[PDB]
Amino acid sequence: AYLWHRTAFILAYRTPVVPEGAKAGASFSANGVALRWLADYDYSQLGDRTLLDV
Amino acid sequence: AYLWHRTAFILAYRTPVVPEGAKAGASFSANGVALRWLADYDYSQLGDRTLLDV
């Protein structure tokens, strides 16, 4: 069991910025944390690559 | 020191076009020269890339 006061632990989150050259992505949320979604096409590997980050 | 007539030297400029596969870019100016700006996201390097050219 863990018993803590509010000030004991600190969490910080930052949503990464979708840059100018990236195709406009989406935005998602995990328990109230904003996640950046991004998709880029690998022509050289003939596929799609997605990244979902914070 | 250089003393020249107007007809002595010639400059020519051409702005590159933004291709179909590139996310549409801006167009800037430098001494009246139109410069093609372009941006592309490197998923492998996890970062954006910008090129400004003529």
Which DSSP string do the residues of B1-54 spell out, in sequence order? -----TTS------PPPP-TTSPP--EEEETTEEEEEEEEEETTTTEEEEEEE-
Q: Is the dihedral of CA B22, B24, B30, B34 positive or negative?
A: positive
Surface-to-core class of residue B41, CB atoms within 10 Å of its CB (0-12 exposed, 13-18 middle, 19+ buried): buried
Residue A38, token pair as written in the block = 């991004």
Answer yes or no: are the C-beta atoms of B38 and B25 closer than 8 Å. yes
Q: Backbone dihedral region of B12: left (phi > 0), alpha (psi from -120 to 50 degrees) or beta?
A: beta
Per the CB < 8 Å rule, is B43 touching A23?
A: no
Closest by alpha carbon to B21, among A28, A45, A43?
A43
How close, in Å, is residue A27 to chain B by CA atoms? 17
**How far separated are the first and last CA of chain A, in Å rounded?**
29
Answer yes or no: are the C-beta atoms of A50 and A36 closer than 8 Å. no
Experimental method: cryo-EM
Residue B52, token pair as written in the block = 């400004």
Interfacial A residues in 12-31 facing B (CB < 8 Å): 19-23
Q: Which residues of B fall within a CB distance of 8 Å from A19?
A: 39, 41, 47-48
Per the CB < 8 Å rule, is A19 touching B43?
A: no
Resolution, rounded to a tenth of an Å? 3.2
Question: How many CB pairs below 8 A link A and B?
Answer: 29
